[PDB]
């Protein structure tokens with residue numbers, strides 16, 4: 001298999017970890033390293049357990065020499081340091097472990113400039129950039145405040161590479177879905193890979209303190225044991241959290257960002273309306289392919305587009321039903337305004353890409369390298385969501401007169417054809 005690995009597997013033995021009731025070994029799979037069943041494994045069969053003595057969570061960093069200096073750092077920042085640190089100690093309790101860890105992943109945080117050019121105009125590129133930058137600052141602020149000061153605990157220098165390394169390791173390895181634990185790293189069940197086969201992301205791991213990894217599916221001897229990293233994440237999110245995406249078009253998403261500008265002559269009243277109904281000055285709406293629009297997107301759109309003619313709805317009189325009206329609809333002008341705004345934004349966005357959906361799809365038809373493959377799937381996906389959105393509002397523009405706006409809804413209850421009320425009027429005075 002692999003010397004460095006052979007070592008890692010031997011170490012787990014001389015620790016009471018890997019015993020005999022452990023149906024799984026390590027091997028070289030298309031996705032790096034994984035866990036292959038040593039013999040038929042059944043659904044919910046405990047695969048392997050790890051002693052908390054071996055975690056790598058804030059509780060461990062706090063209980064180490066640097067625990068003091070990191071005493072006020074954010075949970076992750078603390079683990080970042082811990083990791084960069086232990087990776088240097090020849091007497092580390094994870095010497096064999098780190099000697100197994102991938103130096104890199106296909107997460108966009110490692111992509112070269114050319115590799116990134118393949119995501120030109122994508123939302124993913126934006127998101128990755130932002131994240132890379134943030135992590136940088138936060139990490140450079142760490143160097144000057146903890147690494148350099150305590151030159152006794154941090155002997156060797158520390159580059160951004162080491163930082164992004166630990167950050168990546170953190171975001172692609174740790175198990176956040178756990179109660180009372182959000183960033184736990186477990187050297188054994190670390191090698192478990194992801195598969196679309198697993199459709200029950202309802203924790204493949206439980207706490208007993210120990211880490212019990214139970215296989216969510218029945219596996220025959222020789223085959224790989226997988227798990228579902230996260231059903232709700234988009235391909236954009238999978239692409240950045242780990243270095244991979246799925247073919248499932250339902251994983252494609254594009255998030256729209258709406259806000260009530262302060263330059264809006266009605267900012268104050270509008271913001272009041274939004275907040276009174278669960279929305280902030282700025283609001284993000286995630287749009288997934290083939291899903292119906294998020295509730296709240298249309299009403300908020302109408303709020304944004306409101307305008308002077310209908311500003312009367314922002315009056316105390318309707319503060320108790322305004323959202324309901326926003327939910328139904330305001331007026332033909334309001335609707336038409338917002339529809340155009342969205343359609344234009346979609347067209348504009350669609351134009352930011354350097355490839356057509358056809359070209360992307362022809363490429364997918366050949367052999368694509370890891371990162372290029374990710375970029376192509378991502379961009380095609382986004383173009384689809386973008387087009388779906390424009391498609392939706394194009395229909396709306398057509399049905400611009402089928403909707404019954406505020407005024408019409410008001411005159412619905414007039415009772416023009418009632419009784420000759422004048423006969424009773426004369427019986428009264």
Ligand SMILES: Nc1ncnc2c1ncn2[C@@H]1O[C@H](CSCC[C@H](N)C(=O)O)[C@@H](O)[C@H]1O
Nearest residue numbers: 031032033105172190191193194242243244
């Ligand atoms: N379904 C999948 N397809 C491709 N890569 C995958 C994958 N599931 C997991 N991975 C890879 O493994 C990482 C999760 S940690 C799993 C251990 C890893 N296989 C190793 O050799 O060290 C991901 O960030 C990704 O790079």
Ligand SMILES: N[C@@H](CCCC[NH3+])C(=O)O
Nearest residue numbers: 172173175176177190229
């Ligand atoms: N992201 C997954 C765990 C991935 C583990 C990768 N080895 C979770 O939230 O549980």
